[PDB]
Design a protein around this nucleic acid. Structure first.
Ligand SMILES: O=c1cc[nH]c(=O)[nH]1
Lengths: 220, 50
DNA sequence: AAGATAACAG
DNA sequence: CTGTATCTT
């Protein structure tokens, strides 16, 4: 009913999407065909049926994009940061930080993809199994096309990782409010000091928008 | 690391956006300097210099 | 580009 | 031990 398909040469063959994405689907297909064979040589996180599942999200109700680098080196589900287990480092830190911010102290898990206002995103859509950033070379032009498309819709873009996103503006035509923070899996304890979730709500008020309710993310 | 001091700055910017009277030159200075700071730090923000 | 670095879980 | 980014040459 909002869900169109489109087809591609290599796995996963169909890509389903929501109308909000229609403008990009042509170039995406063209691009994915030029590289898929090559990237598919590797086992990947997530599996190929999951590379695009985040295209089923609408954009018109979104005012914040929370953008990671690429999937978990292992056990990616296709939803950025999602750990069905609540075992991954990165979602744990994020969950702590929301806890401090909100007062919620008892929770089973956390998921960024059930939060009104918010689209969690991964800049690159896959990696070779166990190797962070291994597929950057393949996703490159596609990564830039989708992010630019996402940022037309949202007020605030929050990038998780100083290394990979310090040059993010060069990546986009069109200015958008952009915050670059430490990644949750930083190897000192730098994400514990990040105030970026508060910082988003203050930025949202300054653009006359409703604050994100970060508590919505908890799984009880 | 520096995002606390970024928060503090943004809060003050928002506090001024709300409090600010055009007759008060010191507030406009402070506000305009926060909007510049904010604009260049986050690339774009929802408020303008006055 | 290469190497040193940090800390915590498992 | 290995698995999970940052910063300075
Ligand atoms: O999906 C994910 C998982 C971990 N780190 C990221 O940047 N993205």
């Amino acid at each position: 009913d909002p869900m169109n398909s489109v087809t591609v040469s290599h796995a996963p063959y169909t890509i389903t999407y929501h109308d909000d994405w229609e403008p990009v689907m042509s170039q995406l297909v063209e691009f994915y065909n030029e590289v898929a064979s090559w990237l598919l040589r590797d086992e990947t996180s997530p599996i190929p049926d999951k590379f695009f599942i985040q295209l089923k999200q609408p954009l018109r109700n979104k005012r914040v994009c929370v953008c990671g680098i690429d999937p978990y080196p292992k056990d990616g589900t296709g939803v950025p940061f999602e750990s069905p287990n609540f075992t991954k480092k990165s979602i744990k830190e994020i969950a702590s930080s929301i806890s401090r911010l909100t007062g919620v102290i008892d929770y089973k898990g956390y998921n960024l993809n059930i939060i009104d206002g918010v689209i969690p995103w991964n800049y690159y859509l896959s990696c070779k199994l166990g190797e962070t950033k291994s597929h950057a070379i393949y996703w490159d032009k596609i990564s830039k096309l989708l992010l630019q498309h996402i940022t037309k819709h949202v007020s605030v873009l929050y990038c998780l990782g100083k290394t990979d996103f310090s040059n993010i503006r060069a990546k986009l035509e069109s200015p958008v409010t952009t915050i670059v923070g430490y990644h949750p899996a930083a190897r000192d304890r730098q994400f514990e000091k990040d105030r970026s979730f508060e910082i988003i709500n203050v930025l949202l008020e300054l653009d006359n928008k409703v604050p994100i309710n970060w508590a919505q993310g908890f799984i009880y | 690391m520096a995002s606390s001091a970024d928060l503090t700055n943004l809060k003050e910017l928002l506090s001024l956006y709300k409090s600010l009277r055009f007759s008060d030159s010191a507030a406009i200075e402070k506000y305009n300097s926060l909007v510049e700071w904010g604009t260049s730090t986050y690339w774009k923000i929802g408020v303008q210099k006055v």
